[PDB]
From a paper:
[name], a new Ralstonia solanacearum phage, is a short-tailed phage. The [name] head contains 540 copies of [name] (MCP) [name] and 540 copies of cement protein (CP) [name] arranged in an icosahedral shell with a triangulation number T = 9. The structures of [name] and [name] show a canonical HK97-like fold and an Ig-like fold, respectively. The trimeric CPs stick on the surface of the head along the quasi-threefold axis of the icosahedron generating a sandwiched three-layer electrostatic complementary potential, thereby enhancing the head stability.
Finally, we obtained a 3.7 Å resolution density map of the [name] head that allowed us to build the full atomic models of the MCPs and CPs in the asymmetric unit of the icosahedron. Therefore, the asymmetric unit of the icosahedron contains 9 monomers of [name], which include one E-hexon, one-third C-hexon, and one-fifth penton and the 9 monomers of [name]. According to the gp5 domain nomenclature in HK97, each [name] monomer can be divided into four domains: an especially extended N-arm domain (residues 2–47), a long β-hairpin E-loop domain (residues 48–91), a P-domain (residues 92–140 and 307–342) containing two α-helices and a three-stranded β-sheet, and a highly complex A-domain (residues 141–307 and 343–367) including the long C-arm (residues 348–367). The superposition of the nine monomers (named A-I) of [name] in the asymmetric unit of the head shows significant conformational changes in the N-arms and E-loops resulting in large-scale swinging. The helix α5 (residues 245–255) of monomer A (from penton) adopts a drastically different conformation to the other eight monomers, which results in a greater curvature in the central conformations of the pentons than in the hexons. Accompanying the movements of the α5 helices, the five bulky sidechains (Trp245) in the penton point to the central pore and form a hydrophobic core. In contrast, the sidechain Trp245 in the hexon flips to the opposite direction and inserts into a hydrophobic pocket formed by Leu237, Leu246, Pro261, Ile262, and Leu267 in the same MCP monomer. The structure of the nine CP monomers (named J-R) in the asymmetric unit are basically identical, which is also true of the nine CPs of KHP30. Three acid residues (Asp23) in the trimeric CP point to the axial center of the trimer and are located on the lower surface of the trimer, separated by a distance of approximately 3Å. In addition, along each quasi-three-fold axis, a three-layered sandwich interface structure is formed by complex electrostatic interactions to maintain the stability of the quasi-three-fold axis.
Author numbering:
A (entry chain I): 2 to 53
B (entry chain P), F (entry chain Q), G (entry chain O): 2 to 156
C (entry chain H): 54 to 369
D (entry chain I): 212 to 369
E (entry chain I): 107 to 159
H (entry chain F): 318 to 369
The structure:
C-alpha cells in the first residue's frame, strides 16, 4: 500500500490562529454632538445632582 | 417543539454559587404563550456547569381545565449545548418522574430517589420539561417554573 | 505542520443588566465564541507536450506553450474557485474548469446560504417562485443594503457585515453576472436607466451609459465578471435561468495556503517511454472556505436574481 | 410649546431619525416623492447626488438620518399584523438626563476575583436616569412620525 | 478555562463590557425618545419593558 | 458496628459558609458494605461547629427486599468527636425518629419539630444514622444518603 | 443530436498508459439529461491515441423500464474528431452490436468478436453509444457507464 | 505551587490555599500497557492485632 495519514486521524496536527474576529459594535447615534449642557441640545444633561 | 425561554438563551442569567456547598437558587419561569401539545420540550432553565441539584421545587399553574385531567410533566436534564435550538435534544426523568402537578395548580417538590444523584459536567447542561401525556382539553397563557437548588464544589 | 486552521469569533453580550441596588456579584455573563475550520489540500495538473515525432511535425516548441497554458490554467482555476465558494454552489457555468458534478475540495463542503443571507429579486420567497419579473434591479441592491444594515435587527444571532476599502473608502462590493448588468442597463423597469440618464444630463459623455460599466448605487460599487455562478433549475417548473450576485464585506472567505510565503507553483518534470512525451505538472497547496460562524455565514449576501441569455442564438 | 430647531447640524435645522425600512421605502418607491426631487438634483449635479453616494439629503429644512435602533412595532393595522415604525422628529430639549456621578458619564469599572484567583470578574455600571420631557401632558420637542415600514426582504426569519 | 485557549479572556471581557454599555445607553435613549419598546430585537432589554427608574 | 463514612474519617470534606446565614449543603452519602443490622450506627457526616440544621433531606434505596418490610432508620447527632472509633457512642432521634423509609426507595424530609430546634456547640458534632428496628431480610450494596442544610450564624 | 459526456468535451481528462501493453481503464460515464430516443448518439469517452480496446464493460441503469421494453444500445468508434459538435458523425457496431441492456438494469460485457479487433489510428477517437431502437416510455436521469480497457502499445 | 491566602469573616479565619496544574496517565498505546507489569500477589498482613 502506502501510508495515508488520512482525515481525522489523531496524528493530523491542527494549528489554532491567535487573531480574533470581533462582531464590531453598532455605531451609536446619540454621540457627543446631541448631548449637551446648554439649552441648544437634543438631549440635555442636568448637573444639579452630579455633586450634591 | 423546543420552546426556548429566556434563561436557556442569553437573555436572563442564572447565577453561579461561588464557594463550595453554598446553596444557590434561581427561579426559571416561562409564560407559555401557546397551548402545550402531546409532545413538547420546554427548556426552562440552565443548570450551570459543574453543579448538582440538591432540592427541586416545581411551581406550576393550572394547565388542564377539562374533566379527568391527564397532563404529566417530566422534569429532567436535557443534554446538548446551552441553547442550541434543535428538535434532536431530548430530556429525561431525573428531577421528576411523572408529575401530577398538571391536573390542577399546585406545587410538588422533588421526591424521586434519583433526583439528588445527578452527576457533574464541565459544561452548562439545561433542564427541560417534557409533557409526557395528553394535554387533554385545556391550556392557555400560563406559567411553569421550577426552583432547583444547585451547589458547586460537590464531591 | 497541519492541514486545518481554526479561527474564532467573539459575539457580543446579550444579558439583561440588573437595575436598582440589587446585588450582581452572582449573575454574570458567559462570553460566547464561534469557530470554523479551513482544510487544506493539494491540487495538481499535468500538460503533455508529448511525442518525439509530434514535436518535429510542428514548427513551434511545445514545452514552453504547455508551461504557459499551465500558468494560465491555474490562474483561472483559483479565480473560479474563489467565486465558487463565495457563491456556495456550482450551477451550469460551462467555461468553469471543474465538472458540473462538484461538491468539495478537501471535505470542506459547499454551504448553501441560509434564509437570512439569500435575497431574491423582485417579489419572491423561494428558489421555486422566480419569474420573468424577478430580474435584478436598482430596487434589489437597495434591499441588499438594507439587509446589510439591519441583519441583526431581524436575526439576533448573526454578525454585522461591514464595508471594505474599495475605491475611496468603505463601500460594499457587489459582483454581478454579466447577464444581470445587461438586464439593468438594457431595461427601464430595472430603474438604473432613469437615474443614469439624469446623471448624463449632469455630465455629458462621461456617464456610465456611454463610457463604461455600472456605477455606484447607494455606496455599493457594482462590478461585473464572467465567473459568477449561474443556475438553470430555478423557477416554478424548473428550466428558468438564474444567477448569484455577491454582496461582499470584510472576512467573506478564508484562504490557507499550504506553502511558505503564499501559494508557490512548483513545477515537476518527468518523461515517459524512454524519453518521449515530456510532461510538466505543477500544483499549489491551498484550501478555501466561506466563513460560516454558528450556522449563519459572515460576509456575503447572495442576491439570487433571474438573468436570461440576452441573445438566444447561443448553443443552448 | 412650539418646537425650536437645534444647532447640531448646519444651523437651526430639525433633525429627523428614520428606521432604514422607512429609508428604503423612500429610496425605492415612486409615491414617496424623494426619488423625483433627487433625480432632478442629480441632473443638476451627477455622481454626487444622494441617489449614488449615500443616505438621504435634506427634504425641506430637516436633515434626514437613519439608524438601526429605531423602535418598530408589529401590532399596528386593522388586523394587528401590519409592521410599522416610529420615526423621530427632534429639536431642542427633546429629553434630559441626570448623570448624577460627576462631569460626564463615568463608568465605574470594578474587578473582583471570585475564588482564590480563579475566575476573575470585571463588572461595571453607570448611575444615570433618562426621561423624555413632558410638560403638562404633551411632549416638548419630539414629533413621533409613525408610518408603515415592511420588511423589504421577506426571507428574514423575524 | 483560560488555559484551554490562547485568547486571554480578561481583555476581551473588558472590551465587550465597553461596547455593551455603549450599545445599551444608545438603545435606552432611543427607547425613551420614541416612547415605547417595540417588537425590535437586537435590544438588550426585553420585549416587555416599562422604565428603569 | 460504627460503619463510618468518608466524611467522618476526614477523607472527604464538609463545607463551612463564610458568612452568617448562607444555607450550605453537602451530600453525606455512604456506599455501605455488608448488610444493615439492628443496632448499628452509620456515621454519615459532620455538621461544622457553629451550625444548626435548616432542612434535612434523607434519600435511601431499598434497604430490605422481603415480605412485610419493617426497617426504621433513625438519624441524629452523636456524642464523641468525629474520628474516634468507639462503639460507646450513641446517636439520638432528633432529625428523624422512626423515619420508616427504606421499605421503598422514597425520599423523606424533616417532619419532627425537633429537627429544626437543634442547639449549636463550638465543636464538630457528628450526624449519625442508627437502624432502630430490624432490617427485615437482605440488603447488600444499597446506599444511604442524607443531605443537610445548615447556617452558621444563627441566634 | 450528439449528447456529450464530460470526457469528450475535455472537461474530464482521460488516462493514457506510460508503458507498452499496460492495461488502462477509465469509467466513461454520462448522466442523461431528458430521456433517450431513437437515433441518439451519445459520445461517451475518447479512446486515446494509439490504444485499442481489450475489454469493454457496459453498465446502464434501466433506461426504459416500462413494459415490453424495446431499447437496444449500440456503441462503437466514431469517425469524427475528438469533440466536434458535428451532427453528421456516425457510430458503428464494433464493440456491442445490440447490447439489449437497459431493457432491465444490469451489466453486459463485450461479446462480439469485433470488439478486440479494432485497429489503431494516430489521432484520438471518440467512443459513442448509439441508441438503435426507440425506448418504451423511457426515463430521465439514468446514467450510461462504459468501462473501457485499452493497451497503448499493441502491434 | 501557587500559594494563595484569603481571609474569611472579617479577618477572623486566615486561610492558605495552593495547588499545582498537572495530569498523570500511564502510557497506553493500542490497548496494551507500554511499560508496566502489575503483579497481583497475596498480601496478608502478618500481625492479627492490627485494627481491620
Amino acid at each position: 500500500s502506502s501510508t495515508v495519514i488520512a482525515f481525522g486521524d489523531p496524528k493530523a496536527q491542527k494549528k489554532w490562529s491567535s487573531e480574533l474576529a470581533v462582531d464590531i459594535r453598532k455605531k451609536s447615534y446619540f454621540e457627543s454632538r446631541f448631548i449637551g449642557t446648554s439649552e441648544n441640545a437634543v438631549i440635555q444633561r442636568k448637573t444639579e445632582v452630579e455633586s450634591d | 417543539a423546543l420552546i426556548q425561554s429566556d434563561f436557556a438563551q442569553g437573555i436572563r442569567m442564572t447565577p453561579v454559587p461561588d464557594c463550595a456547598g453554598d446553596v444557590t437558587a434561581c427561579r426559571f419561569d416561562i409564560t407559555l404563550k401557546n397551548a402545550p401539545a402531546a409532545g413538547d420540550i420546554i427548556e426552562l432553565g440552565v443548570l450551570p456547569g459543574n453543579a448538582v441539584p440538591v432540592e427541586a421545587i416545581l411551581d406550576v399553574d393550572d394547565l388542564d381545565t377539562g374533566g379527568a385531567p391527564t397532563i404529566t410533566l417530566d422534569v429532567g436534564i436535557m443534554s446538548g449545548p446551552v441553547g442550541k435550538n434543535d428538535p434532536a435534544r431530548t430530556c429525561g426523568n431525573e428531577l421528576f418522574a411523572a408529575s401530577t402537578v398538571g391536573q390542577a395548580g399546585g406545587v410538588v417538590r422533588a421526591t424521586a430517589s434519583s433526583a439528588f444523584r445527578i452527576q457533574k459536567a464541565e459544561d452548562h447542561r439545561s433542564v427541560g420539561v417534557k409533557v409526557a401525556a395528553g394535554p387533554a382539553t385545556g391550556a392557555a397563557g400560563k406559567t411553569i417554573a421550577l426552583i432547583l437548588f444547585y451547589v458547586q464544589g460537590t464531591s | 505542520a497541519g492541514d486545518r486552521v481554526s479561527f474564532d469569533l467573539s459575539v457580543r453580550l446579550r444579558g439583561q443588566p440588573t437595575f436598582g441596588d440589587d446585588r450582581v456579584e452572582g449573575k454574570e455573563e458567559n462570553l460566547k465564541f464561534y469557530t470554523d475550520e479551513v482544510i487544506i489540500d493539494q491540487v495538481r495538473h499535468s500538460v503533455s507536450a508529448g511525442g518525439r515525432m509530434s514535436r518535429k511535425r510542428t514548427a513551434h516548441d511545445l514545452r514552453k506553450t504547455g508551461r504557459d497554458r499551465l500558468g494560465d490554467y491555474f490562474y483561472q482555476l483559483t479565480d473560479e474557485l474563489f467565486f465558487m465558494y463565495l457563491s456556495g454552489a456550482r450551477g451550469i457555468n460551462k467555461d468553469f474548469i471543474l465538472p458540473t458534478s462538484f461538491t468539495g475540495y478537501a471535505k470542506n463542503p459547499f454551504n448553501t446560504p441560509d434564509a437570512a443571507h439569500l435575497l431574491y429579486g423582485g417579489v419572491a420567497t423561494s428558489k421555486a417562485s422566480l419569474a420573468n419579473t424577478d430580474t435584478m434591479s436598482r430596487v434589489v441592491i437597495e434591499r441588499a443594503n438594507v439587509q446589510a444594515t439591519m441583519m441583526q435587527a431581524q436575526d439576533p444571532e448573526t454578525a454585522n457585515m461591514v464595508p471594505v476599502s474599495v475605491e475611496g473608502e468603505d463601500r460594499y462590493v457587489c459582483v454581478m453576472s454579466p447577464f444581470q448588468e445587461h438586464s439593468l442597463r438594457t431595461s427601464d423597469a430595472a430603474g438604473w436607466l432613469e437615474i443614469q440618464k439624469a446623471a448624463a444630463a449632469a455630465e455629458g459623455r462621461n456617464n456610465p451609459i456611454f463610457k463604461g460599466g455600472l456605477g455606484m448605487i447607494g455606496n455599493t460599487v457594482l462590478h461585473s465578471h464572467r465567473n459568477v455562478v449561474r443556475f438553470s433549475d430555478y423557477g416554478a417548473g424548473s428550466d428558468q435561468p438564474a444567477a448569484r450576485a455577491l454582496f461582499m464585506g470584510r472576512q467573506a472567505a478564508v484562504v490557507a495556503y499550504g506553502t511558505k510565503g503564499g501559494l508557490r507553483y512548483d513545477w515537476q518534470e518527468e518523461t515517459k517511454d524512454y524519453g518521449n512525451e515530456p510532461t510538466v505538472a505543477s500544483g499549489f497547496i491551498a484550501g478555501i472556505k466561506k466563513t460560516r460562524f454558528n450556522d449563519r455565514d459572515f460576509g456575503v449576501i447572495s442576491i439570487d436574481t433571474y438573468a436570461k441569455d440576452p441573445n438566444p442564438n447561443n448553443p443552448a
